Design a binder for this molecule. Structure first.
Ligand SMILES: O[C@H](c1cc(C(F)(F)F)nc2c(C(F)(F)F)cccc12)[C@@H]1CCCCN1
Ligand SMILES: O[C@H](c1cc(C(F)(F)F)nc2c(C(F)(F)F)cccc12)[C@@H]1CCCCN1
Ligand SMILES: [Mg+2]
Ligand SMILES: [Mg+2]
Ligand SMILES: [Mg+2]
Ligand SMILES: [Mg+2]
Ligand SMILES: [Mg+2]
Lengths: 40, 103, 125, 170, 207, 201
RNA sequence: AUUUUAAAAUUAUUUGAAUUUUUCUUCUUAUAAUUUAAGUUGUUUCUAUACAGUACUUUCUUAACCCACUCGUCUUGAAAC
RNA sequence: UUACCGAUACCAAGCCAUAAAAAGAAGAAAAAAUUUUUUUUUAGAAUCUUUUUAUGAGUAGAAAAUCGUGGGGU
RNA sequence: UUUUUGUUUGCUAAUGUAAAAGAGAAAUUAUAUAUGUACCGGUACAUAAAUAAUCCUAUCAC
């Protein structure tokens, strides 16, 4: 059900919203990358 | 990232065809992830460009392009018919084509 | 196919070559209409040479117009040049293949005076 | 002669009018020769006359045997057409002489045009079967030999487009 | 002027007859017998402060904010030069995919709307079309390479209309920029280019 | 069929249908690597299949069997033949398409590290009722003289161990990534985080 | 060089009616305009500030997709073994 | 049960011919320039011109319109 | 191997691509169930179950 709802959200999103999501992902990646580096 | 897509990818397939009759006036195009009639209709007015490379330079370049309009959907499975300014060469039958977002 | 340029429509740019003119030397390309049983061309089987037919003809209005839009008029002499003084936008001069060079030059000169186009000015130039 | 030369000062020509040799063998020989320094060609001819190196019969190869020397030209068939070779040699010699008479170095001369045309057949009669006369004609030839001494648009829009492309690349 | 047939209300715009056509059996006459051509009428998504993606230009894929419905049908667009790099650019409605996002919907930038509107109004149609003289001058440079380009650029700069346009653009930037900057995500979005990827089906997209 | 090269895992598929699927793709313009061809299933009973094969073999050219129907008995080879059958191979385009196809028994050098795809409309589990007789292609091949079946099986088994090893590592990596994500979700920005949560990620 | 008119329709007016009380309500008295009449015109590029270029035209050349059986002939019937 | 593909058949539009039908023994239009020049035309060939509509398979055969070759008078 | 410019007498500078626009994605296996994990194929516990309807990877120039 959750996945369905996620899919629906994705479908209905505005371009800006998609962009926002992308930005968020990028931020996470940055943070994630940093964490990985630290671990190393 | 260098270069921005902005088009849907496609494959320029056969001509519009009988079993053994040609019809070079229309080309059949498969558009990436569009599998149904309904989806196909979305692309109806979009402009299609077959871009191709050559050895001899022309207008000072090795790449030239033939333009088309995308005319109608084609049978149940998301394929579309496209009509071009000049008919496409059949050398093209397995090639990639671009379906732009304009109109 | 069809060869639109201006309003000038040509239905069939390809020449209709004689059947089998491509198979035996002795048979020239000049259209001849096939007769006799079992022709294939006569019978119009898919894949053979086409038969010239009246459908192919150009619109009565643009017919003998060349790409220029002027009817070609053959010119052997100044006297002949003269009928087209009141027609420089509708007929274009071609100088006869057999005209000597001086005469040709003269004709060309005349044409320029008249504002009439010459389609073959360059012969012996 | 058939070739487009431009400058005949660096060229030496030689011809054979109606040779009493077979057109096909001679043709083959000519082919073998072609695109070679004159002296080398002469040497080759000499060798063929003495049955040391063969000429490869590649065009008119119907029934011609299967020699050992043909491996030199990546072929299987080859022959040593004696009389024809001799004739060719003579013509080569003539050409050389002509060159000498002018002012061309024989070491730097290459055969640029070795043409063999077939002349009019010399008619003879052979007798066959049940009282039947048949043509026993020859295949004469003309030989022509030439030796030679051997050592946008701009458009403003287009320009703009190009510039843009360059920028993109950068 | 407008006509209301069958309940459409189409709106007429005065047009000029330019093409001449040969008469049947005497002297030529103008092609157009019609004096008024129906107005373009844009789609029910093109607004005054929405962000759109330019599909075809040199700034291909850039996200630029819409400015003025420029009466000639085609609209004016700005990606506030000091942020996105898109100048005061005239564009057709078809070569722009307008997103559902509006600038004047944000709480910070909504108050500076009247000024923007005024600025848009100030921009005109004839300020875009380059006069023939300039074109001629540009051409004259064809008869080294980069030097030519530089010359062309200089010529372009020289144009008084062009200068005016530039000034207008600058003014717009001044008006808008700081607010945009403050909305950092929004600014980033504006900056970035829209690219289709291997998941974006396009036909199911509601952007 | 817009990928560079599709690697198809032929295990658990139904032969003819699979071939058909391949052929169209090939025609369109897609490089296909049919991998693991020993485990392709045929819808007939094994014995029936064998009989059919025998019959096929029997139809050879009477004058000189050096020409005529070449009875290629490798499972991959068989698959290839089938594919060809469903193609206009006598033309140029058809030939090209045929060439584009590559068939492999088991898994070789590069096609162990590439993602293996499955054709769901051709699967045996989805196309046959489970009270009908089916036949493994490898077995059939063996029956009509292929010999290298056991060896192939052994190779496959060996590969499996390697895959398992790799898989474990992959799993570990995934877990690590997840952990990192969990850690870092609190280190971003509130609104952004919320947005991310909303969109599934 | 008068059926690219006349009317229809529409727009802004003006007189009288109607029951379908209605910013497309209809007829009608009169006037201008317009196009939904009365078969496509306009805007901006580009070719191009070119004389021929790699662009454009066209002849030839192979490709390629699809098709295509030796013509004449006598014959119910010929690609005909 | 839908959906679709699919003819030289059908429909819509053009153009070609054929057949028939309407009908026919005087006149300035526009553009570009800068009120006057320049640019185009300014039609009337009866088997001809303008327009309209329908139609177009074809061996044996018939007819018509053309096209070309050797010579003749003009 | 790296760099630069180019491939705009029969020759002696030299071009071609049936396919780049992110051509992204390595468990295995069953289909009336599989996969791990931990012990001894068996047991117990997890885990997938519209599985690519996903995940990864993009634009942060200077
Ligand atoms: O089409 C059948 C057939 C052929 C071949 C092939 F040619 F590939 F070896 N394989 C078949 C198989 C196969 F073994 F699965 F390949 C099964 C059933 C029929 C087959 C044969 C062909 C001759 C007449 C009917 N049986
Ligand atoms: O029919 C009139 C006409 C008159 C005369 C005339 F009376 F002079 F002999 N001759 C005509 C001729 C003519 F006989 F050849 F002279 C042809 C056509 C019309 C003619 C036309 C009427 C339209 C204007 C031209 N003359
Ligand atoms: Mg018959
Ligand atoms: Mg016959
Ligand atoms: Mg065929
Ligand atoms: Mg009989
Ligand atoms: Mg008829």
């Amino acid at each position: 059900g959750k996945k369905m709802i996620i899919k629906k959200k994705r479908d209905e999103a505005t371009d800006f919203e998609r962009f926002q999501v992308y930005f968020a992902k990028r931020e996470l990646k940055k943070k994630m990358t940093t964490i990985k580096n630290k671990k190393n | 990232l260098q270069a921005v897509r902005l088009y849907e990818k496609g494959v320029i397939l056969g001509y519009k065809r009988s079993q053994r009759n040609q019809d070079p006036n229309f080309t059949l195009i498969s558009i990436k992830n569009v599998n149904t009639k309904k989806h196909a209709q979305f692309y109806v007015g979009k402009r299609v460009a077959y871009v191709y490379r050559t050895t001899k330079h022309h207008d000072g370049v090795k790449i030239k392009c033939i333009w088309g309009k995308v005319c109608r959907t084609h049978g149940n499975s998301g394929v579309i018919r496209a009509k071009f300014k000049t008919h496409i060469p059949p050398k093209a039958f397995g090639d990639r084509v671009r379906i732009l977002m304009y109109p | 196919a069809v060869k639109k340029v201006g309003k000038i429509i040509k239905k069939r740019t390809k020449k209709f070559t004689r059947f089998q003119s491509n198979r035996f030397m002795r048979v020239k390309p000049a259209w001849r209409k096939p007769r006799g049983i079992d022709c294939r061309v006569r019978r119009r089987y898919k894949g053979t040479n086409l038969m010239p037919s009246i459908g192919y003809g150009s619109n009565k209005k643009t017919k003998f117009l060349l790409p220029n839009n002027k009817y070609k008029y053959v010119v052997k002499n100044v006297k002949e040049m003269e009928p087209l003084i009141m027609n420089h936008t509708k007929y274009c001069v071609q100088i006869a293949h057999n005209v000597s060079s001086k005469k040709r030059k003269q004709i060309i000169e005349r044409a320029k005076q008249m504002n009439v186009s010459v389609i073959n000015a360059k012969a012996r130039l | 002669y058939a070739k487009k030369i431009r400058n005949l000062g660096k060229c030496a020509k030689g011809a054979g009018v109606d040779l009493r040799v077979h057109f096909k063998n001679t043709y083959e020989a000519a082919r073998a020769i072609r695109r070679m320094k004159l002296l080398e060609a002469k040497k080759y001819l000499n060798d063929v006359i003495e049955k040391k190196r063969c000429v490869p019969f590649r065009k008119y190869n119907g029934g011609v045997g299967r020699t050992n020397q043909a491996k030199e030209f990546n072929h299987t068939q080859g022959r040593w057409p004696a009389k024809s070779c001799k004739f060719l040699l003579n013509i080569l010699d003539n050409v050389q002489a002509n060159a000498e008479s002018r002012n061309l170095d024989v070491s730097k001369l290459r055969l640029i045009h070795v043409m063999v045309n077939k002349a009019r057949p010399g008619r003879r009669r052979t007798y066959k079967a049940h009282g039947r006369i048949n043509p026993f004609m020859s295949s004469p030839c003309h030989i022509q030999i030439i030796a030679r001494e051997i050592n946008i648009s701009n458009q403003n829009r287009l320009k703009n487009k190009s510039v843009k492309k360059q920028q993109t690349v950068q | 002027k407008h006509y209301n047939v069958k309940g459409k209300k189409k709106v007429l715009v005065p047009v000029n007859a330019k093409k001449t056509i040969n008469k049947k059996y005497f002297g030529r006459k103008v092609a157009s017998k019609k004096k008024y051509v129906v107005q373009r009428k844009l789609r029910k998504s093109i607004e005054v402060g929405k962000v759109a993606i330019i599909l075809t230009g040199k700034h291909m894929g850039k996200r630029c904010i819409i400015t003025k419905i420029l009466n000639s049908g085609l609209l004016a667009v700005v990606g506030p030069y000091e942020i996105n790099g898109v100048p005061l650019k005239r564009v057709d409605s078809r070569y722009l995919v307008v997103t559902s996002t509006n600038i004047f919907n944000f709480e910070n930038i909504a108050k500076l709307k009247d000024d923007f509107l005024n600025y848009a109004q100030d921009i005109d149609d004839d300020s875009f079309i380059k006069t023939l003289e300039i074109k001629k001058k540009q051409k004259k440079l064809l008869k080294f390479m980069n030097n030519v380009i530089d010359k062309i650029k200089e010529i372009r700069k020289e144009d008084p209309k062009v200068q005016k346009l530039e000034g207008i653009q600058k003014d717009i930037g001044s008006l808008l920029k700081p607010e945009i900057l403050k909305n950092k995500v929004f600014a980033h979005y504006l900056k970035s280019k829209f690219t289709l990827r291997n998941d974006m089906v396009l036909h199911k997209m509601k952007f | 069929m817009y990928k560079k090269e599709y690697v198809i895992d032929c295990k658990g598929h139904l032969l003819g249908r699979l071939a058909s699927l391949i052929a169209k793709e090939l025609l369109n313009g897609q490089r296909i690597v049919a991998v693991r061809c020993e485990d392709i299933n045929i819808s007939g009973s094994l014995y029936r299949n064998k009989l059919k094969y025998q019959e096929f073999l029997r139809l050879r050219t009477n004058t000189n069997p050096k020409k005529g129907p070449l009875h290629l008995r490798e499972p991959s080879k068989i698959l290839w033949r089938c594919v060809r059958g469903m193609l206009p191979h006598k033309t140029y385009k058809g030939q090209l398409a045929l060439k584009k196809l590559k068939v492999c028994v088991g898994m070789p050098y590069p096609y162990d590290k590439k993602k293996k795809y499955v054709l769901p409309s051709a699967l045996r589990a989805f196309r046959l009722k489970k009270h009908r007789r089916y036949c493994r292609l490898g077995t059939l091949s063996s029956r009509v003289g292929w010999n290298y079946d056991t060896l192939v099986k052994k190779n496959e088994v060996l590969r499996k161990q390697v895959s398992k090893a790799y898989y474990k590592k992959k799993v570990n990596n995934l877990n690590e990534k997840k952990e990192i994500k969990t850690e870092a979700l609190n280190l971003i920005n509130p609104e952004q985080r919320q947005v991310l949560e909303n969109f599934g990620y």
